[PDB]
Design a protein around this ligand. Structure first.
Ligand code: ATP
Ligand code: MG
Lengths: 49, 203, 51
């Protein structure tokens, strides 16, 4: 779900546009903070650059 | 839809005398089968002109050159008879349908769909002028944005049949207006190729 | 819900299979499909329970 949400409008926004799906907005991550929510944000950020 | 270009492609190859002996005689077979079966009768008279000084010609009502390098070229009188018959027949059928659509209101969608069929027949027989007229009435009755775009492409295609680059060019200005009215990506791809082929046709 | 205080009461059901196809058709105008897809077919694959 994160590679759809964050990574897909950075590589190209227009992928959405031309199929004719309007893009999702904001991401809320919830859960005990021990679950590695925070850890996932840092993981895909180093990866997308 | 399908013979309209495929017969023209082979007929161009057949015209040349600057092709291989073998390639011209393979083409010639596809062209000839399709005149008789599909009733390409008027474009077939047209095509006898288009050699002239190039060889192959072996027609019974139209000029011949001294050197026939082909024989998958013949004019028959049955072709002419057929024309006359088939013409009246198709014309008579649909007409009556159009009048029926006038009596009981149904004429928005169905009368334009009848006139689409009339231009496809007209187009089949190789008349750009009278295909276009019928495809003109189709517009006036109020139809979907999709249908309107599809029709203009068909007309521009008849430009390719007679290999008239200007006839293509003029019609494809009008599609540029409607393309974003419908807003389709489907008929935009068709547009990309339609244009593709037209741009390929010029230098 | 005492007398005269509430005088029109509007129950709303889950959707019909004809009604569920009409919501789908609205959404298909934002998207770019392929032709030959019936959305009456889709409404029958679904059964939904809400809009
Ligand atoms: N999937 C996992 N693989 C490896 N280590 C993990 C994993 N999930 C979490 N951890 C480790 O657990 C710790 C907490 O994760 P993170 O840094 O993402 O914070 P968080 O849960 O959002 O906390 P808060 O938001 O309250 O500060 C980190 O050190 C992280 O590397
Ligand atoms: Mg954290």
């Amino acid at each position: 779900e994160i590679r759809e949400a964050v990574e897909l409008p950075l590589v190209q926004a227009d992928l959405y546009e031309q199929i004719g799906i309007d893009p999702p907005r904001g991401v809320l991550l919830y859960g005990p903070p021990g679950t590695g929510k925070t850890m996932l944000v840092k993981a895909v950020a180093n990866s997308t650059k | 839809r399908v013979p309209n270009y495929e017969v023209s492609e082979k007929a161009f190859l057949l015209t040349q005398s600057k092709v291989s002996i073998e390639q011209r005689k393979e083409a010639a077979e596809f062209v000839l089968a399709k005149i008789k079966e599909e009733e390409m009768a008027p474009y077939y008279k047209y095509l006898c002109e288009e050699y002239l000084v190039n060889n192959g010609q072996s027609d019974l009502e139209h000029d011949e050159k001294s050197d026939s390098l082909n024989e998958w070229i013949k004019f028959d009188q049955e072709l002419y008879n057929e024309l006359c018959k088939k013409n009246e027949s198709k014309i008579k059928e649909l007409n009556e349908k159009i009048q029926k659509l006038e009596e009981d209101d149904e004429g928005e969608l169905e009368q334009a769909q009848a006139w689409i069929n009339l231009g496809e027949y007209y187009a089949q027989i190789g008349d750009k002028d009278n295909a276009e007229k019928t495809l003109g009435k189709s517009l006036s009755k109020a139809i979907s944005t999709g249908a309107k775009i599809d029709v203009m492409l068909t007309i521009a295609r008849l430009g390719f049949f007679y290999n008239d680059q200007l006839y293509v060019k003029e019609k494809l200005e009008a599609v540029n207006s409607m393309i974003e009215k419908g807003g389709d990506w489907e008929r935009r791809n068709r547009y990309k190729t339609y244009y593709g082929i037209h741009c390929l046709a010029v230098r | 819900l005492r007398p005269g205080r509430i005088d029109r009461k509007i129950e709303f059901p889950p959707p019909s299979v004809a009604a569920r196809a009409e919501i789908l058709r609205i959404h298909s105008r934002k998207m770019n499909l392929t032709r030959g897809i019936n959305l009456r077919k889709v409404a029958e694959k679904m059964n939904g329970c809400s809009g």
